Design a protein around this ligand. Structure first.
Ligand SMILES: [Cl-]
Ligand SMILES: [Zn+2]
Length: 274
């Protein structure tokens, strides 16, 4: 029956929902200053010229990458640890973990802000990879992300000390398999008693179809600029859309939960270390 945001908060408050799975994309980090693909004006769809790209996805495609790795490595240099900080959206997910409710957070983001926010790696699936590690594209030797940092920050394409191949950060490109941890979805999605979806267009698979893998009795709460993906075309009866700014949506839920002061203290402490 037609749920509101307040109904979902009450399910949590009454402990009817104990195992929350969360799916996020780039829209949770635009408040930190990191541009997504699809927001009007600031999205990569509107800024191709600055990255020298023919279209936004080429930055994550192998043929274009081997042809010209420079645009990807400009982004790598922007997103390497240290530059951006998590915002209130991330700290809400952190608080959700601290309050014993997070079964797992599945992210398409490569900005590593989930880990920086203090969410333990065991609770995270970085489904489209990470800059924390890198692999020679030729001989497949693995490297810590640290090993190529000087070259990334100096605009030099990192090269393998064994074979001179291009050393590529472990970001999943189109056509590539997602990491092995992604298979946690097989047991995580049937176990979930609540799905939260935040800040994504749901336009990339197999990540996007995961919204379908929860039981039909499980509410799916989207907090996003617009109604998207399998939520827009296959709506279920317990789906809830909170449309608008992601942080304003999160703030309304957090206040319904009773967590506002705790969330603000958390944000104050954490962002100030960094
Ligand atoms: Cl893997
Ligand atoms: Zn090599």
């Amino acid at each position: 029956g037609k749920l509101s945001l307040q109904d979902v908060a009450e399910l949590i408050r009454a402990r009817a929902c104990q195992r929350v799975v969360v799916m996020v994309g780039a829209g949770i980090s635009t408040p930190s200053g990191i541009p997504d693909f699809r927001s009007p004006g600031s999205g990569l769809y509107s800024n191709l010229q600055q990255y020298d790209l023919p279209y936004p996805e080429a930055i994550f495609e192998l043929p274009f990458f081997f042809h010209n790795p420079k645009p990807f490595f400009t982004l790598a240099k922007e997103l390497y640890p240290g530059n951006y900080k998590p915002n209130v959206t991330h700290y809400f997910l952190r608080l959700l973990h601290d309050k014993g409710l997070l079964l797992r957070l599945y992210t398409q983001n490569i900005d590593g802000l989930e880990r920086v926010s203090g969410i333990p790696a065991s609770k995270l699936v970085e489904a489209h990879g990470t800059f924390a590690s890198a692999t020679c594209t030729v001989c497949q030797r693995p490297f810590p992300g640290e090993d190529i940092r000087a070259d990334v920050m100096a605009d030099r394409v990192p090269r393998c000390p064994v074979c001179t191949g291009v050393v590529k950060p472990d970001i999943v490109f189109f056509g590539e398999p997602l990491p092995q941890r992604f298979l946690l979805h097989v047991v995580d999605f049937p176990m979930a008693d609540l799905l939260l979806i935040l800040g994504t267009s749901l336009e990339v698979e197999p990540f996007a179809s995961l919204t379908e893998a929860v039981r039909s009795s499980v509410p799916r709460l989207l907090i996003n600029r617009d109604l998207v993906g399998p939520l827009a075309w296959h709506p279920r009866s317990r789906d809830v859309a909170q449309l608008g700014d992601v942080v304003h949506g999160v703030e309304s839920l957090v206040e319904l939960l009773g967590w506002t002061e705790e969330m603000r203290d958390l944000v104050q402490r954490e962002t100030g270390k960094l």
